Amino acid sequence: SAPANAVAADDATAIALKYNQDATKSERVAAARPGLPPEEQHCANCQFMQADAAGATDEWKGCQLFPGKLINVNGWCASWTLKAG
Numbered sequence: 379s380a381p382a383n384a385v386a387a388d389d390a391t392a393i394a395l396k397y398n399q400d401a402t403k404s405e406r407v408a409a410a411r412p413g414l415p416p417e418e419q420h421c422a423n424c425q426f427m428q429a430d431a432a433g434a435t436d437e438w439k440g441c442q443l444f445p446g447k448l449i450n451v452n453g454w455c456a457s458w459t460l461k462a463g
C-alpha cells in the first residue's frame with residue numbers, strides 16, 4: 379500500500395505541481411516536457427528527486443520538492459526534468 383506520508387493527489391503542493399501517482403493520467407503528455415518521452419518520464423527519473431528519504435520504501439521514494447513526504451517513483455509532477463547525472 380502507499381505509506382502514511384505518501385504525497386496525496388490532493389496535497390496542496392501536489393495540486394500546484396500537478397503531481398499524480400498515476401503519471402500516465404497526469405499532465406505528462408499534455409506538458410510534453412523535453413529530455414525523455416512522456417511515457418518513460420516519472421519521479422523515478424526526475425532531477426528534483428530523493429532516494430535520500432527517511433523511510434524510503436522502493437515504489438515510494440523522496441522528491442526534492444517534497445522532503446519528509448514520499449512520492450511514488452512511477453508517478454510524475456510538472457516540475458520533472460530528466461536526471462542530470
Ligand code: SF4
Pocket residue numbers: 395397420421422424425426427428440441442443444449453454455456457458
Ligand atoms: S519534482 Fe520530480 S520527484 Fe518530485 S514529484 Fe515532481 S516529478 Fe516527482
